[PDB]
Amino acid sequence: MIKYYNINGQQVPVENATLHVSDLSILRGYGIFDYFLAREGHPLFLDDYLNRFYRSAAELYLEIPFDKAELRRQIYALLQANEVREAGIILVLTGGYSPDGYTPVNPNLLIMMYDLPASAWEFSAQGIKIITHPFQRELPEVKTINYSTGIRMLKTIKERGATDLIYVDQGEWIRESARSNFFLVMPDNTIVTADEKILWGITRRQVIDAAREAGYAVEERRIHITELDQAREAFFTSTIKGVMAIGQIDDRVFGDGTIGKVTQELQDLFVGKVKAYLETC
Amino acid sequence: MIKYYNINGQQVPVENATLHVSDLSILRGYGIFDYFLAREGHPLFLDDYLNRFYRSAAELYLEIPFDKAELRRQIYALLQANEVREAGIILVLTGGYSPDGYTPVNPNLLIMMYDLPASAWEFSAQGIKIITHPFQRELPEVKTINYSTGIRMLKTIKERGATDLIYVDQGEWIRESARSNFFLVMPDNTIVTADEKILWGITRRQVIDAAREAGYAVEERRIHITELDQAREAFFTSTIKGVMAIGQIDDRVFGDGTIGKVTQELQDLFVGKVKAYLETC
Numbered sequence A, B: 001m002i003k004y005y006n007i008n009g010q011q012v013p014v015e016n017a018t019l020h021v022s023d024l025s026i027l028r029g030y031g032i033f034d035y036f037l038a039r040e041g042h043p044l045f046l047d048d049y050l051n052r053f054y055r056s057a058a059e060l061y062l063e064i065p066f067d068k069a070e071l072r073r074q075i076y077a078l079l080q081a082n083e084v085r086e087a088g089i090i091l092v093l094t095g096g097y098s099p100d101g102y103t104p105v106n107p108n109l110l111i112m113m114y115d116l117p118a119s120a121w122e123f124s125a126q127g128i129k130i131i132t133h134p135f136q137r138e139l140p141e142v143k144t145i146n147y148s149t150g151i152r153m154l155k156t157i158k159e160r161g162a163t164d165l166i167y168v169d170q171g172e173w174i175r176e177s178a179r180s181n182f183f184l185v186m187p188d189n190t191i192v193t194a195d196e197k198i199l200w201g202i203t204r205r206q207v208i209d210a211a212r213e214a215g216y217a218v219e220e221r222r223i224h225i226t227e228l229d230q231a232r233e234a235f236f237t238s239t240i241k242g243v244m245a246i247g248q249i250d251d252r253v254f255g256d257g258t259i260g261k262v263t264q265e266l267q268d269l270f271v272g273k274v275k276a277y278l279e280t281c
Protein backbone atom coordinates (compact mmCIF):
# COMPACT_ATOMS: atom_id res chain seq x y z
CA MET A 1 0.00 0.00 0.00
CA ILE A 2 1.45 3.47 -0.85
CA LYS A 3 2.75 5.29 2.28
CA TYR A 4 4.56 8.41 0.99
CA TYR A 5 4.69 10.95 -1.80
CA ASN A 6 7.51 13.52 -2.26
CA ILE A 7 6.86 17.32 -2.14
CA ASN A 8 9.87 19.57 -2.89
CA GLY A 9 12.42 16.89 -1.86
CA GLN A 10 10.55 15.93 1.39
CA GLN A 11 8.98 12.43 1.78
CA VAL A 12 5.42 13.13 3.17
CA PRO A 13 2.68 10.67 4.22
CA VAL A 14 0.07 10.67 1.38
CA GLU A 15 -2.60 12.05 3.76
CA ASN A 16 -0.42 15.17 4.48
CA ALA A 17 0.53 15.75 0.79
CA THR A 18 -1.11 19.18 0.14
CA LEU A 19 -0.42 22.53 -1.57
CA HIS A 20 -1.51 25.94 -0.36
CA VAL A 21 -4.41 27.27 -2.51
CA SER A 22 -2.12 30.13 -3.86
CA ASP A 23 -0.33 27.49 -6.04
CA LEU A 24 -0.52 28.52 -9.73
CA SER A 25 -1.68 25.01 -10.84
CA ILE A 26 -4.87 25.49 -8.76
CA LEU A 27 -5.54 29.15 -9.83
CA ARG A 28 -4.08 29.30 -13.39
CA GLY A 29 -3.47 25.68 -14.55
CA TYR A 30 0.23 26.58 -14.87
CA GLY A 31 2.57 23.63 -14.81
CA ILE A 32 3.92 20.47 -16.33
CA PHE A 33 3.19 16.71 -15.88
CA ASP A 34 5.01 13.41 -16.53
CA TYR A 35 3.97 9.80 -15.81
CA PHE A 36 5.97 6.56 -16.15
CA LEU A 37 5.68 2.97 -14.92
CA ALA A 38 8.15 1.10 -12.69
CA ARG A 39 8.74 -2.68 -13.19
CA GLU A 40 11.22 -4.92 -11.26
CA GLY A 41 11.95 -1.84 -9.08
CA HIS A 42 12.93 0.28 -12.18
CA PRO A 43 11.26 3.32 -13.79
CA LEU A 44 11.00 2.31 -17.49
CA PHE A 45 13.11 4.44 -20.00
CA LEU A 46 13.65 6.86 -17.11
CA ASP A 47 16.33 8.99 -18.79
CA ASP A 48 13.90 9.68 -21.74
CA TYR A 49 10.98 10.59 -19.34
CA LEU A 50 13.27 12.83 -17.22
CA ASN A 51 14.79 14.54 -20.30
CA ARG A 52 11.18 15.32 -21.40
CA PHE A 53 10.25 16.69 -17.94
CA TYR A 54 13.27 19.07 -18.00
CA ARG A 55 12.31 20.11 -21.64
CA SER A 56 8.60 20.74 -20.65
CA ALA A 57 9.79 22.72 -17.59
CA ALA A 58 12.17 24.87 -19.77
CA GLU A 59 9.25 25.86 -22.10
CA LEU A 60 7.25 27.24 -19.16
CA TYR A 61 10.53 28.88 -17.76
CA LEU A 62 10.18 26.82 -14.54
CA GLU A 63 13.47 25.75 -12.89
CA ILE A 64 13.31 22.23 -11.45
CA PRO A 65 15.01 22.68 -8.04
CA PHE A 66 17.57 19.81 -8.47
CA ASP A 67 19.45 18.25 -11.38
CA LYS A 68 18.37 15.04 -13.19
CA ALA A 69 20.62 12.71 -11.06
CA GLU A 70 19.11 14.13 -7.85
CA LEU A 71 15.48 13.77 -9.15
CA ARG A 72 16.34 10.17 -10.19
CA ARG A 73 17.75 9.60 -6.65
CA GLN A 74 14.49 10.94 -5.14
CA ILE A 75 12.31 8.72 -7.39
CA TYR A 76 14.33 5.57 -6.42
CA ALA A 77 14.24 6.68 -2.75
CA LEU A 78 10.42 6.97 -2.93
CA LEU A 79 10.12 3.44 -4.47
CA GLN A 80 12.24 2.06 -1.55
CA ALA A 81 10.26 4.00 1.07
CA ASN A 82 6.95 2.62 -0.30
CA GLU A 83 8.65 -0.84 -0.64
CA VAL A 84 7.22 -1.29 -4.18
CA ARG A 85 8.73 -2.85 -7.38
CA GLU A 86 5.68 -2.26 -9.71
CA ALA A 87 4.13 1.27 -9.81
CA GLY A 88 2.76 4.31 -11.58
CA ILE A 89 4.80 7.51 -10.88
CA ILE A 90 3.44 11.05 -11.52
CA LEU A 91 5.84 14.04 -11.64
CA VAL A 92 4.19 17.51 -11.34
CA LEU A 93 5.93 20.86 -11.54
CA THR A 94 3.53 23.79 -10.82
CA GLY A 95 4.14 27.53 -11.26
CA GLY A 96 4.48 27.85 -7.48
CA TYR A 97 2.93 29.96 -4.69
CA SER A 98 2.66 33.18 -6.80
CA PRO A 99 2.38 36.53 -4.93
CA ASP A 100 -0.19 37.89 -7.45
CA GLY A 101 -2.01 34.71 -8.55
CA TYR A 102 -0.38 34.97 -12.06
CA THR A 103 3.44 35.51 -11.96
CA PRO A 104 5.28 32.22 -11.47
CA VAL A 105 7.94 31.82 -8.80
CA ASN A 106 9.87 28.82 -7.48
CA PRO A 107 7.81 25.88 -8.69
CA ASN A 108 6.27 23.19 -6.40
CA LEU A 109 7.64 19.72 -7.38
CA LEU A 110 5.41 16.72 -6.68
CA ILE A 111 6.34 13.02 -6.96
CA MET A 112 3.29 10.79 -6.46
CA MET A 113 3.08 6.96 -6.60
CA TYR A 114 0.28 4.45 -7.36
CA ASP A 115 -0.09 0.69 -7.99
CA LEU A 116 0.78 -0.30 -11.56
CA PRO A 117 -2.57 0.25 -13.31
CA ALA A 118 -4.67 -3.03 -13.57
CA SER A 119 -5.12 -2.31 -17.35
CA ALA A 120 -1.39 -1.57 -18.04
CA TRP A 121 -0.56 -3.23 -21.44
CA GLU A 122 -3.85 -5.26 -21.42
CA PHE A 123 -3.28 -5.74 -25.21
CA SER A 124 -6.97 -6.60 -25.83
CA ALA A 125 -7.49 -8.38 -29.21
CA GLN A 126 -10.83 -6.38 -29.38
CA GLY A 127 -10.12 -2.84 -30.76
CA ILE A 128 -11.59 0.12 -28.82
CA LYS A 129 -14.45 2.37 -30.11
CA ILE A 130 -13.43 6.09 -30.49
CA ILE A 131 -14.86 9.33 -31.93
CA THR A 132 -13.17 12.14 -33.89
CA HIS A 133 -13.23 15.53 -32.14
CA PRO A 134 -12.16 18.81 -33.85
CA PHE A 135 -9.50 20.40 -31.52
CA GLN A 136 -5.79 21.41 -31.31
CA ARG A 137 -3.97 21.25 -27.90
CA GLU A 138 -2.06 24.39 -26.72
CA LEU A 139 1.79 24.15 -26.63
CA PRO A 140 1.33 20.56 -27.95
CA GLU A 141 5.11 19.76 -27.75
CA VAL A 142 4.96 20.44 -23.94
CA LYS A 143 3.49 17.91 -21.46
CA THR A 144 1.43 20.61 -19.59
CA ILE A 145 -1.15 19.91 -16.84
CA ASN A 146 -3.84 21.35 -19.27
CA TYR A 147 -6.26 18.39 -19.91
CA SER A 148 -9.56 20.31 -19.64
CA THR A 149 -10.87 19.53 -23.25
CA GLY A 150 -10.15 15.76 -22.89
CA ILE A 151 -11.71 15.64 -19.36
CA ARG A 152 -14.77 17.71 -20.36
CA MET A 153 -15.32 15.40 -23.40
CA LEU A 154 -15.60 12.29 -21.08
CA LYS A 155 -19.38 12.75 -20.84
CA THR A 156 -19.94 12.98 -24.65
CA ILE A 157 -17.48 10.06 -25.31
CA LYS A 158 -19.38 7.72 -22.89
CA GLU A 159 -22.78 9.12 -24.09
CA ARG A 160 -21.94 8.23 -27.73
CA GLY A 161 -20.83 4.65 -26.90
CA ALA A 162 -17.06 5.44 -27.27
CA THR A 163 -14.24 5.01 -24.70
CA ASP A 164 -11.90 7.66 -26.17
CA LEU A 165 -11.37 10.31 -28.87
CA ILE A 166 -8.92 11.42 -31.57
CA TYR A 167 -8.32 15.18 -31.88
CA VAL A 168 -8.47 16.47 -35.44
CA ASP A 169 -6.98 20.00 -35.85
CA GLN A 170 -9.84 22.00 -37.52
CA GLY A 171 -11.49 18.72 -38.56
CA GLU A 172 -8.62 18.33 -41.11
CA TRP A 173 -5.35 17.06 -39.48
CA ILE A 174 -5.21 13.94 -37.25
CA ARG A 175 -3.16 14.58 -34.10
CA GLU A 176 -3.52 12.53 -30.91
CA SER A 177 -5.98 11.82 -28.03
CA ALA A 178 -5.75 13.79 -24.69
CA ARG A 179 -3.26 11.17 -23.31
CA SER A 180 -2.18 8.89 -26.30
CA ASN A 181 -0.28 9.15 -29.60
CA PHE A 182 -2.21 7.93 -32.69
CA PHE A 183 -0.99 5.74 -35.56
CA LEU A 184 -2.37 4.30 -38.82
CA VAL A 185 -1.13 1.17 -40.62
CA MET A 186 -1.68 1.39 -44.38
CA PRO A 187 -2.61 -1.72 -46.42
CA ASP A 188 1.04 -1.79 -47.81
CA ASN A 189 2.12 -1.96 -44.08
CA THR A 190 3.52 1.62 -44.05
CA ILE A 191 2.99 3.00 -40.51
CA VAL A 192 1.81 6.65 -40.38
CA THR A 193 1.77 9.03 -37.39
CA ALA A 194 1.70 12.83 -36.88
CA ASP A 195 5.12 14.63 -36.67
CA GLU A 196 3.99 18.21 -35.74
CA LYS A 197 1.65 19.80 -33.07
CA ILE A 198 1.50 16.61 -30.94
CA LEU A 199 3.33 15.57 -27.76
CA TRP A 200 6.41 13.39 -28.63
CA GLY A 201 5.46 10.38 -26.41
CA ILE A 202 8.07 7.99 -24.92
CA THR A 203 5.90 5.02 -26.08
CA ARG A 204 5.59 6.57 -29.64
CA ARG A 205 9.44 6.83 -29.66
CA GLN A 206 10.03 3.13 -28.65
CA VAL A 207 7.28 1.87 -31.07
CA ILE A 208 8.63 3.96 -33.99
CA ASP A 209 12.23 2.67 -33.30
CA ALA A 210 10.92 -0.91 -32.96
CA ALA A 211 8.90 -0.60 -36.26
CA ARG A 212 11.99 0.69 -38.19
CA GLU A 213 14.13 -2.12 -36.65
CA ALA A 214 11.55 -4.67 -38.00
CA GLY A 215 11.98 -3.07 -41.46
CA TYR A 216 8.63 -1.16 -41.51
CA ALA A 217 8.36 2.15 -43.39
CA VAL A 218 7.32 4.71 -40.70
CA GLU A 219 6.10 8.04 -42.09
CA GLU A 220 6.01 11.03 -39.62
CA ARG A 221 3.94 13.61 -41.50
CA ARG A 222 0.63 15.51 -41.42
CA ILE A 223 -2.32 13.04 -41.80
CA HIS A 224 -5.50 14.25 -43.55
CA ILE A 225 -8.80 13.10 -41.90
CA THR A 226 -9.77 11.44 -45.26
CA GLU A 227 -6.64 9.21 -44.95
CA LEU A 228 -8.52 7.16 -42.24
CA ASP A 229 -10.23 5.50 -45.26
CA GLN A 230 -6.75 4.48 -46.59
CA ALA A 231 -5.71 2.72 -43.29
CA ARG A 232 -6.13 -1.00 -42.47
CA GLU A 233 -5.29 -0.44 -38.76
CA ALA A 234 -5.39 2.29 -36.09
CA PHE A 235 -3.75 2.14 -32.64
CA PHE A 236 -2.80 4.36 -29.71
CA THR A 237 0.48 4.38 -27.83
CA SER A 238 0.81 5.66 -24.23
CA THR A 239 2.73 4.82 -21.07
CA ILE A 240 -0.29 2.79 -19.68
CA LYS A 241 -1.70 1.40 -23.00
CA GLY A 242 1.61 0.43 -24.58
CA VAL A 243 0.06 -0.37 -28.03
CA MET A 244 -3.77 -0.47 -28.04
CA ALA A 245 -5.91 -1.64 -31.01
CA ILE A 246 -8.59 0.80 -32.22
CA GLY A 247 -11.37 -1.22 -33.80
CA GLN A 248 -13.80 1.64 -34.62
CA ILE A 249 -13.53 5.42 -35.36
CA ASP A 250 -16.99 7.04 -35.62
CA ASP A 251 -18.85 4.89 -38.28
CA ARG A 252 -15.68 3.05 -39.63
CA VAL A 253 -14.79 -0.44 -38.38
CA PHE A 254 -11.10 -1.22 -38.96
CA GLY A 255 -11.11 -4.71 -40.48
CA ASP A 256 -13.42 -6.84 -38.33
CA GLY A 257 -12.80 -4.64 -35.20
CA THR A 258 -10.11 -7.05 -33.82
CA ILE A 259 -6.41 -6.11 -33.52
CA GLY A 260 -4.56 -5.81 -36.87
CA LYS A 261 -1.42 -7.83 -37.76
CA VAL A 262 1.09 -4.92 -37.50
CA THR A 263 -0.52 -3.62 -34.26
CA GLN A 264 -0.10 -7.13 -32.72
CA GLU A 265 3.57 -7.30 -33.89
CA LEU A 266 4.22 -3.78 -32.45
CA GLN A 267 2.72 -4.95 -29.04
CA ASP A 268 5.33 -7.75 -28.94
CA LEU A 269 8.19 -5.42 -30.04
CA PHE A 270 7.17 -2.81 -27.40
CA VAL A 271 7.45 -5.55 -24.72
CA GLY A 272 10.85 -6.34 -26.35
CA LYS A 273 12.02 -2.71 -25.78
CA VAL A 274 10.80 -2.90 -22.10
CA LYS A 275 12.67 -6.20 -21.45
CA ALA A 276 15.84 -4.81 -23.18
CA TYR A 277 15.57 -1.66 -20.95
CA LEU A 278 15.17 -3.75 -17.72
CA GLU A 279 18.26 -5.89 -18.78
CA THR A 280 20.38 -2.60 -18.67
CA CYS A 281 19.23 -1.82 -15.00
CA MET B 1 -5.09 41.89 7.20
CA ILE B 2 -6.80 38.79 5.67
CA LYS B 3 -7.45 36.07 8.31
CA TYR B 4 -9.61 33.43 6.56
CA TYR B 5 -10.43 31.85 3.23
CA ASN B 6 -13.38 29.45 2.63
CA ILE B 7 -12.84 25.82 1.45
CA ASN B 8 -16.02 23.80 0.73
CA GLY B 9 -18.19 25.95 3.05
CA GLN B 10 -15.62 25.94 5.95
CA GLN B 11 -13.89 29.21 7.03
CA VAL B 12 -10.13 28.24 7.33
CA PRO B 13 -7.15 30.36 8.45
CA VAL B 14 -5.23 31.31 5.25
CA GLU B 15 -2.14 29.37 6.44
CA ASN B 16 -4.22 26.10 6.64
CA ALA B 17 -5.97 26.64 3.26
CA THR B 18 -4.64 23.63 1.25
CA LEU B 19 -5.81 20.94 -1.21
CA HIS B 20 -4.59 17.36 -1.37
CA VAL B 21 -2.29 16.85 -4.40
CA SER B 22 -4.91 14.46 -6.02
CA ASP B 23 -7.04 17.57 -6.84
CA LEU B 24 -7.70 17.72 -10.62
CA SER B 25 -6.69 21.45 -10.84
CA ILE B 26 -3.14 20.47 -9.75
CA LEU B 27 -2.85 17.33 -12.00
CA ARG B 28 -5.06 18.22 -15.03
CA GLY B 29 -5.79 21.99 -14.87
CA TYR B 30 -9.49 21.11 -14.63
CA GLY B 31 -11.66 23.82 -13.16
CA ILE B 32 -13.20 27.24 -13.31
CA PHE B 33 -12.26 30.71 -11.91
CA ASP B 34 -14.06 33.99 -11.10
CA TYR B 35 -12.77 37.24 -9.57
CA PHE B 36 -14.68 40.36 -8.46
CA LEU B 37 -14.00 43.42 -6.29
CA ALA B 38 -15.86 44.42 -3.11
CA ARG B 39 -16.41 48.15 -2.30
CA GLU B 40 -18.33 49.61 0.72
CA GLY B 41 -18.66 45.99 1.97
CA HIS B 42 -20.37 44.89 -1.34
CA PRO B 43 -19.21 42.53 -4.13
CA LEU B 44 -19.73 44.64 -7.30
CA PHE B 45 -22.41 43.30 -9.81
CA LEU B 46 -22.38 40.09 -7.75
CA ASP B 47 -25.44 38.49 -9.38
CA ASP B 48 -23.74 38.81 -12.85
CA TYR B 49 -20.40 37.32 -11.55
CA LEU B 50 -22.25 34.46 -9.76
CA ASN B 51 -24.46 33.72 -12.80
CA ARG B 52 -21.21 33.44 -14.85
CA PHE B 53 -19.60 31.11 -12.27
CA TYR B 54 -22.64 28.75 -12.38
CA ARG B 55 -22.53 28.91 -16.28
CA SER B 56 -18.72 28.14 -16.37
CA ALA B 57 -19.28 25.28 -13.88
CA ALA B 58 -22.15 23.82 -16.03
CA GLU B 59 -19.85 23.69 -19.13
CA LEU B 60 -17.31 21.54 -17.26
CA TYR B 61 -20.25 19.44 -15.75
CA LEU B 62 -19.13 20.44 -12.21
CA GLU B 63 -21.94 20.83 -9.63
CA ILE B 64 -21.34 23.76 -7.26
CA PRO B 65 -22.27 22.23 -3.86
CA PHE B 66 -24.77 25.00 -2.83
CA ASP B 67 -27.18 27.31 -4.64
CA LYS B 68 -26.42 30.95 -5.57
CA ALA B 69 -28.05 32.44 -2.40
CA GLU B 70 -25.93 30.17 -0.19
CA LEU B 71 -22.67 31.03 -2.08
CA ARG B 72 -23.61 34.75 -1.75
CA ARG B 73 -24.18 34.16 2.01
CA GLN B 74 -20.72 32.54 2.29
CA ILE B 75 -19.02 35.41 0.40
CA TYR B 76 -20.66 38.05 2.69
CA ALA B 77 -19.81 35.88 5.74
CA LEU B 78 -16.13 35.78 4.65
CA LEU B 79 -16.05 39.62 4.23
CA GLN B 80 -17.43 39.97 7.82
CA ALA B 81 -14.99 37.40 9.23
CA ASN B 82 -12.02 39.25 7.65
CA GLU B 83 -13.63 42.58 8.76
CA VAL B 84 -13.00 44.15 5.30
CA ARG B 85 -15.12 46.55 3.14
CA GLU B 86 -12.68 46.80 0.14
CA ALA B 87 -11.31 43.52 -1.38
CA GLY B 88 -10.47 41.21 -4.24
CA ILE B 89 -12.41 37.89 -4.12
CA ILE B 90 -11.35 34.76 -6.09
CA LEU B 91 -13.82 31.87 -6.59
CA VAL B 92 -12.26 28.53 -7.73
CA LEU B 93 -14.12 25.34 -8.55
CA THR B 94 -11.72 22.42 -9.30
CA GLY B 95 -12.55 18.97 -10.71
CA GLY B 96 -12.06 17.50 -7.23
CA TYR B 97 -10.01 14.70 -5.63
CA SER B 98 -10.32 12.29 -8.62
CA PRO B 99 -9.76 8.54 -7.97
CA ASP B 100 -7.85 8.10 -11.29
CA GLY B 101 -6.21 11.52 -11.74
CA TYR B 102 -8.57 12.29 -14.71
CA THR B 103 -12.30 11.61 -13.94
CA PRO B 104 -13.87 14.53 -12.08
CA VAL B 105 -15.86 14.00 -8.91
CA ASN B 106 -17.34 16.39 -6.34
CA PRO B 107 -15.50 19.63 -7.02
CA ASN B 108 -13.41 21.55 -4.42
CA LEU B 109 -14.84 25.10 -3.97
CA LEU B 110 -12.40 27.82 -2.90
CA ILE B 111 -13.24 31.39 -1.83
CA MET B 112 -10.09 33.47 -1.35
CA MET B 113 -9.78 37.17 -0.37
CA TYR B 114 -7.13 39.89 -0.92
CA ASP B 115 -6.78 43.67 -0.43
CA LEU B 116 -8.37 45.67 -3.26
CA PRO B 117 -5.51 45.80 -5.78
CA ALA B 118 -3.41 49.06 -5.48
CA SER B 119 -3.82 49.55 -9.30
CA ALA B 120 -7.64 48.93 -9.35
CA TRP B 121 -9.13 51.51 -11.81
CA GLU B 122 -5.85 53.55 -11.90
CA PHE B 123 -7.22 55.15 -15.14
CA SER B 124 -3.73 56.28 -16.26
CA ALA B 125 -3.90 59.02 -18.97
CA GLN B 126 -0.75 57.29 -20.47
CA GLY B 127 -1.87 54.31 -22.68
CA ILE B 128 -0.11 50.95 -22.10
CA LYS B 129 2.31 49.30 -24.60
CA ILE B 130 1.11 45.85 -25.86
CA ILE B 131 2.07 43.25 -28.50
CA THR B 132 -0.10 41.11 -30.80
CA HIS B 133 0.22 37.35 -30.22
CA PRO B 134 -1.31 34.71 -32.58
CA PHE B 135 -3.44 32.40 -30.32
CA GLN B 136 -7.06 31.24 -29.61
CA ARG B 137 -8.08 30.29 -26.00
CA GLU B 138 -9.78 26.88 -25.45
CA LEU B 139 -13.51 26.95 -24.44
CA PRO B 140 -13.23 30.79 -24.68
CA GLU B 141 -16.84 31.35 -23.42
CA VAL B 142 -15.88 29.56 -20.13
CA LYS B 143 -13.82 31.26 -17.38
CA THR B 144 -11.49 28.19 -16.93
CA ILE B 145 -8.35 28.11 -14.73
CA ASN B 146 -6.31 27.57 -18.00
CA TYR B 147 -3.99 30.66 -18.23
CA SER B 148 -0.77 28.87 -19.29
CA THR B 149 -0.27 30.75 -22.68
CA GLY B 150 -0.76 34.21 -21.05
CA ILE B 151 1.54 33.30 -18.08
CA ARG B 152 4.24 31.74 -20.31
CA MET B 153 4.18 34.89 -22.54
CA LEU B 154 5.07 37.15 -19.51
CA LYS B 155 8.79 36.77 -20.25
CA THR B 156 8.50 37.73 -23.98
CA ILE B 157 6.06 40.63 -23.16
CA LYS B 158 8.52 42.18 -20.62
CA GLU B 159 11.52 41.34 -22.91
CA ARG B 160 9.93 43.26 -25.82
CA GLY B 161 9.16 46.38 -23.73
CA ALA B 162 5.38 45.61 -23.48
CA THR B 163 3.20 45.14 -20.35
CA ASP B 164 0.51 42.98 -22.01
CA LEU B 165 -0.69 41.26 -25.19
CA ILE B 166 -3.71 40.94 -27.50
CA TYR B 167 -4.49 37.44 -28.80
CA VAL B 168 -5.18 37.30 -32.52
CA ASP B 169 -6.84 34.01 -33.65
CA GLN B 170 -4.49 32.71 -36.44
CA GLY B 171 -2.99 36.21 -36.76
CA GLU B 172 -6.33 37.26 -38.38
CA TRP B 173 -9.12 37.86 -35.77
CA ILE B 174 -8.66 40.15 -32.71
CA ARG B 175 -9.99 38.50 -29.55
CA GLU B 176 -8.87 39.50 -26.05
CA SER B 177 -5.82 39.38 -23.69
CA ALA B 178 -5.37 36.49 -21.15
CA ARG B 179 -7.41 38.47 -18.53
CA SER B 180 -9.03 41.51 -20.36
CA ASN B 181 -11.62 42.20 -23.09
CA PHE B 182 -10.37 44.37 -26.00
CA PHE B 183 -12.12 47.28 -27.73
CA LEU B 184 -11.45 49.69 -30.61
CA VAL B 185 -12.93 53.18 -31.06
CA MET B 186 -13.23 54.14 -34.73
CA PRO B 187 -12.66 57.75 -35.88
CA ASP B 188 -16.53 58.12 -36.35
CA ASN B 189 -16.75 57.11 -32.59
CA THR B 190 -18.24 53.63 -33.36
CA ILE B 191 -16.99 51.27 -30.61
CA VAL B 192 -15.94 47.79 -31.86
CA THR B 193 -15.32 44.62 -29.82
CA ALA B 194 -15.28 40.85 -30.52
CA ASP B 195 -18.63 38.95 -30.12
CA GLU B 196 -17.45 35.30 -30.60
CA LYS B 197 -14.64 33.05 -29.12
CA ILE B 198 -13.91 35.45 -26.21
CA LEU B 199 -14.96 35.41 -22.54
CA TRP B 200 -18.08 37.64 -22.01
CA GLY B 201 -16.57 39.86 -19.24
CA ILE B 202 -18.70 41.60 -16.56
CA THR B 203 -16.74 44.84 -17.21
CA ARG B 204 -17.26 44.47 -21.05
CA ARG B 205 -21.04 44.09 -20.30
CA GLN B 206 -21.26 47.29 -18.11
CA VAL B 207 -19.07 49.32 -20.57
CA ILE B 208 -21.10 48.17 -23.62
CA ASP B 209 -24.41 49.07 -21.80
CA ALA B 210 -22.93 52.41 -20.68
CA ALA B 211 -21.70 53.19 -24.28
CA ARG B 212 -25.18 52.44 -25.78
CA GLU B 213 -26.83 54.58 -23.02
CA ALA B 214 -24.53 57.51 -24.06
CA GLY B 215 -25.76 57.02 -27.67
CA TYR B 216 -22.57 55.33 -29.04
CA ALA B 217 -22.83 52.77 -31.84
CA VAL B 218 -21.32 49.55 -30.36
CA GLU B 219 -20.54 46.84 -32.93
CA GLU B 220 -20.02 43.24 -31.56
CA ARG B 221 -18.51 41.43 -34.55
CA ARG B 222 -15.32 39.71 -35.78
CA ILE B 223 -12.45 42.28 -36.03
CA HIS B 224 -9.78 41.77 -38.72
CA ILE B 225 -6.15 42.48 -37.56
CA THR B 226 -5.89 45.12 -40.38
CA GLU B 227 -8.79 47.04 -38.73
CA LEU B 228 -6.30 48.23 -36.00
CA ASP B 229 -5.23 50.79 -38.67
CA GLN B 230 -8.88 52.05 -38.83
CA ALA B 231 -9.11 52.68 -35.02
CA ARG B 232 -8.39 55.99 -33.21
CA GLU B 233 -8.42 54.29 -29.76
CA ALA B 234 -7.83 50.88 -28.14
CA PHE B 235 -8.67 49.92 -24.53
CA PHE B 236 -9.03 46.89 -22.28
CA THR B 237 -11.82 46.18 -19.83
CA SER B 238 -11.39 43.86 -16.81
CA THR B 239 -12.54 43.63 -13.20
CA ILE B 240 -9.22 45.23 -11.96
CA LYS B 241 -8.52 47.62 -14.92
CA GLY B 242 -12.06 48.91 -15.36
CA VAL B 243 -11.28 50.78 -18.66
CA MET B 244 -7.55 51.00 -19.48
CA ALA B 245 -6.07 53.10 -22.35
CA ILE B 246 -3.80 51.24 -24.80
CA GLY B 247 -1.38 53.74 -26.25
CA GLN B 248 0.72 51.34 -28.42
CA ILE B 249 0.16 47.97 -30.20
CA ASP B 250 3.42 46.63 -31.69
CA ASP B 251 4.73 49.55 -33.91
CA ARG B 252 1.40 51.60 -33.91
CA VAL B 253 0.93 54.51 -31.49
CA PHE B 254 -2.77 55.30 -30.98
CA GLY B 255 -2.97 59.08 -31.33
CA ASP B 256 -0.18 60.54 -29.20
CA GLY B 257 -0.17 57.47 -26.83
CA THR B 258 -2.40 59.25 -24.23
CA ILE B 259 -5.97 58.14 -23.41
CA GLY B 260 -8.53 58.81 -26.21
CA LYS B 261 -11.71 60.89 -25.73
CA VAL B 262 -14.21 57.96 -25.82
CA THR B 263 -11.97 55.78 -23.57
CA GLN B 264 -11.92 58.64 -20.98
CA GLU B 265 -15.75 59.04 -21.21
CA LEU B 266 -16.19 55.22 -20.80
CA GLN B 267 -13.94 55.35 -17.61
CA ASP B 268 -16.37 57.89 -16.10
CA LEU B 269 -19.47 55.91 -17.20
CA PHE B 270 -17.99 52.66 -15.77
CA VAL B 271 -17.58 54.44 -12.39
CA GLY B 272 -21.23 55.57 -12.91
CA LYS B 273 -22.37 51.91 -13.23
CA VAL B 274 -20.37 51.00 -10.04
CA LYS B 275 -21.93 53.89 -8.01
CA ALA B 276 -25.45 52.98 -9.35
CA TYR B 277 -24.80 49.31 -8.30
CA LEU B 278 -23.64 50.33 -4.76
CA GLU B 279 -26.80 52.58 -4.41
CA THR B 280 -28.96 49.35 -4.84
CA CYS B 281 -27.07 47.53 -1.93
Ligand SMILES: *Cc1c(COP(=O)(O)O)cnc(C)c1O
Pocket (backbone or CB within 6 Å): A137, A143, A176, A177, A178, A179, A180, A181, A199, A200, A201, A202, A203, A204, A237, A238, A239, A240
Ligand atom coordinates in the same frame (compact mmCIF):
# COMPACT_ATOMS: atom_id res chain seq x y z
C1 LIG C 1 1.49 11.95 -22.11
C2 LIG C 1 0.88 12.12 -23.43
C3 LIG C 1 1.00 11.25 -24.53
C4 LIG C 1 1.70 9.93 -24.44
O1 LIG C 1 3.09 10.03 -24.01
P1 LIG C 1 3.82 8.71 -23.41
O2 LIG C 1 5.18 9.31 -23.04
O3 LIG C 1 3.82 7.54 -24.42
O4 LIG C 1 2.95 8.32 -22.21
C5 LIG C 1 0.39 11.61 -25.70
N1 LIG C 1 -0.30 12.76 -25.85
C6 LIG C 1 -0.45 13.59 -24.83
C7 LIG C 1 -1.19 14.87 -25.02
C8 LIG C 1 0.11 13.28 -23.59
O5 LIG C 1 -0.05 14.16 -22.57
Ligand SMILES: *Cc1c(COP(=O)(O)O)cnc(C)c1O
Pocket (backbone or CB within 6 Å): B137, B143, B176, B177, B178, B179, B180, B181, B199, B200, B201, B202, B203, B204, B237, B238, B239, B240
Ligand atom coordinates in the same frame (compact mmCIF):
# COMPACT_ATOMS: atom_id res chain seq x y z
C1 LIG D 1 -11.80 37.20 -16.61
C2 LIG D 1 -11.50 37.46 -18.02
C3 LIG D 1 -11.83 38.61 -18.75
C4 LIG D 1 -12.45 39.82 -18.11
O1 LIG D 1 -13.71 39.54 -17.43
P1 LIG D 1 -14.25 40.59 -16.31
O2 LIG D 1 -15.51 39.87 -15.86
O3 LIG D 1 -14.43 42.02 -16.89
O4 LIG D 1 -13.12 40.63 -15.28
C5 LIG D 1 -11.51 38.65 -20.08
N1 LIG D 1 -10.90 37.63 -20.71
C6 LIG D 1 -10.57 36.53 -20.05
C7 LIG D 1 -9.93 35.39 -20.78
C8 LIG D 1 -10.83 36.43 -18.69
O5 LIG D 1 -10.48 35.29 -18.05
